[PDB]
Amino acid sequence: SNAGMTGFVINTRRAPFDDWRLREALLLAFNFEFINDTVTGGVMPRITSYFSGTDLAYRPGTASGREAELLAPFAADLPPGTLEGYALPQGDGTARNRTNLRRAAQFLEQAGFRIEQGQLLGPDGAPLALRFLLRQGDSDMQTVLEIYTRALERLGIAAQIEKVDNAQYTARVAELDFDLTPFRRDLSLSPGNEQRLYWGSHSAGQPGTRNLMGAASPAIDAMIDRMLAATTEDELTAATRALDRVLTAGRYVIPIWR
Numbered sequence: 249s250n251a252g253m254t255g256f257v258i259n260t261r262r263a264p265f266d267d268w269r270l271r272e273a274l275l276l277a278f279n280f281e282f283i284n285d286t287v288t289g290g291v292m293p294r295i296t297s298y299f300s301g302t303d304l305a306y307r308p309g310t311a312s313g314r315e316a317e318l319l320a321p322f323a324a325d326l327p328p329g330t331l332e333g334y335a336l337p338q339g340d341g342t343a344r345n346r347t348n349l350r351r352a353a354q355f356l357e358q359a360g361f362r363i364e365q366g367q368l369l370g371p372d373g374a375p376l377a378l379r380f381l382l383r384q385g386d387s388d389m390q391t392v393l394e395i396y397t398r399a400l401e402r403l404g405i406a407a408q409i410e411k412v413d414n415a416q417y418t419a420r421v422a423e424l425d426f427d428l429t430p431f432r433r434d435l436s437l438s439p440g441n442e443q444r445l446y447w448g449s450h451s452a453g454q455p456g457t458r459n460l461m462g463a464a465s466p467a468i469d470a471m472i473d474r475m476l477a478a479t480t481e482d483e484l485t486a487a488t489r490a491l492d493r494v495l496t497a498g499r500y501v502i503p504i505w506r
Contacts, residue, residue: 250301257431292505322467368404461500
């Protein structure tokens with residue numbers, strides 16, 4: 249049951265959300281530990297990867313052994329930090345979260361965003377528009393995003409919650425018409441062909457897709473192929489963990505609790 253991702257999915261098809269450095273900044277600005285203290289009393293652990301809390305979760309630190317061999321052909325093209333050992337940002341245990349917000353500002357600056365009159369301009373010179381597409385009745389997510397919005401304001405990003413009715417929510421998600429939206433994907437301990445529908449390149453562009461993030465990478469596609477093809481336990485575990493590692497480093501979802 250532990251496998252699965254819950255959080256805010258980022259539409260990587262929509263510039264400038266296609267830039268991993270913007271996604272990294274968005275992840276650093278999300279103060280999970282403070283939000284979790286506030287909304288949950290701090291009792292619910294963060295989801296740390298797609299297969300976290302299972303044997304299929306990647307092992308923290310540098311990719312080694314068979315996992316590293318499976319990933320090595322894609323090394324030049326993997327999300328930065330994939331092989332080095334990527335982990336989600338951890339806040340400082342306060343509301344202000346100073347260090348991570350500074351790092352997030354630095355990633356924005358590196359990616360060509362500039363602050364002009366307290367507004368963060370994208371590389372194209374226009375203010376970054378960030379709307380959270382939210383179902384009307386989703387009060388727990390509304391509370392989360394209200395907190396998060398205030399953090400993003402400190403980066404010069406005037407993020408907006410766009411609350412819509414269920415019919416609109418269904419339409420907008422089906423048409424991939426959003427920046428960020430709440431997301432849940434339930435995952436099996438025996439993942440199979442459906443993984444192509446969730447994260448595979450061919451599903452990225454397609455109306456109605458489960459691949460809301462628009463993940464499209466040869467490395468993801470290859471790890472799914474390797475998982476499905478595996479004839480040993482060692483190989484199946486290695487391929488599944490490699491998939492978990494690449495999906496997590498893709499910075500597609502801002503994870504919360506389950």
